[PDB]
Amino acid sequence: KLELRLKSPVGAEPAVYPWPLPVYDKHHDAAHEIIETIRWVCEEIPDLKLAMEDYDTKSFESMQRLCDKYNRAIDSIHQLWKGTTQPMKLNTRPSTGLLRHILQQVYNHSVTDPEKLNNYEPFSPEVYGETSFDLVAQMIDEIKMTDDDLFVDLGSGVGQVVLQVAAATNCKHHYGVEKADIPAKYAETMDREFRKWMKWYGKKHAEYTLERGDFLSEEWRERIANTSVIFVNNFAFGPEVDHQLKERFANMKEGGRIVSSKPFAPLNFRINSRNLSDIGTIMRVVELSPLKGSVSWTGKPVSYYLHTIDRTILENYFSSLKNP
């Protein structure tokens, strides 16, 4: 059995690839994953980049040559580290660039038949759609979580939002919960592959768990109440599900935040006597800045919304009713 092997820069088990190298979709294949993996390890380690500084992706010999060259360079670096040279700092977070490649790699090794994710009932709250790496990167940059925070993706799909946030932030725990069998099944493999690849690159992530469950269940009422940052792609959920979610958000703590693809209260909410029980009485809503040149299917640019629990809105309304 012909095989390509890439040694780990930190001495984990080598990544092994069968030949012929498989294709993942029209734009991704294992041959270019190998090449980009070498490239990224070269970014992690300058001396390796230096040692690397005629790739026919369809020729075995030629790809084996690339692999052996990387593998020989990894051995020499490992020897440098037994000398006076300081070994790669371990347990750091991956850069944004590396993380994107890791998630791509993890997805392609896990989501073995992507078409199966489109076998949901259409026009139902089970409609599946993936939030892009770039949006999640923006949210990470703009929300700024600390180790006091708990992060939950409600309806986590195959789990890639949770993996990215877990790789990038120091929340005490990250959760995803997903109800449908197909994506939750894939989420099990995403999880294993993410832990494997992260050890392989020698990078740390914060604690996370991917769960099969229904986030409208009784168990999930208290969990939502105690969550400080909720991510929820509720674009296709519909009004009954969003209403139920509103009822659960009303128990969140001051300063709790929800990032969503459809707003849970209007942006122009003015508290008055008719709307006293509406969820807009206890939260600020703002529209996150669109990322430059990102059109949605509607033609307008992709739109996400940040909600912050803030009951001073309601307290101020009540004091107002005492003072003309």
Enumerate binding residues for ligand SX0 (CB under 6 A). 125-126, 128-131, 153, 155-157, 161, 177-180, 183, 214-216, 233, 237, 241
Shortest Å, Cβ 63 to ligand SX0:
33
Cβ neighbours for 187, distance < 8 A, ≥ 6 positions apart: 156, 157, 158, 159, 176, 178, 210, 212
Measured from the CB atom, the residue of 138 and 233 that comes closer to ligand SX0 is: 233
> CA end-to-end span of the chain, whole Å?
85
Is 214 among the annotated ligand-binding positions? Answer: yes
| 151 marked as part of a ligand binding site | yes
Shortest distance (Å) from residue 259 CB to ligand SX0: 10
158 known ligand binder: yes
- Nearer to ligand SX0 by Cβ, of 217 and 320: the residue is 217
Q: How far is the CB of 50 from ligand SX0 (least distance, A)?
A: 38
Enumerate residues 6+ apart whose C-beta is below 8 A from 308.
Answer: 255, 256, 257, 283, 284
The Cβ of residue 193 has, within 10 Å, a number of other Cβ atoms equal to: 20
In the bound state with ligand SX0, the residue whose beta carbon lies nearer, of 34 and 136, is 136
| In the complex, least distance from residue 102 CB atom to ligand SX0, rounded to whole angstroms | 16
Strands 257-260 and 229-232: parallel
Question: How far apart are the C-alpha atoms of 215 and 153, rounded to whole Å?
Answer: 10
Q: Is 149 annotated as a binding residue?
A: no
Angle, to 10 degrees, between the axis of helix 60-80 and the axis of helix 30-44? 20
CB of 95 vs ligand SX0, minimal distance in Å: 22
Output the CA angle 240-244-250, nearest 5 degrees: 145
Give the residue nearest to ligand SX0 (CB). Answer: 155
Binding residue positions for S-adenosyl-L-methionine: 128-131, 151-160, 178, 214-215
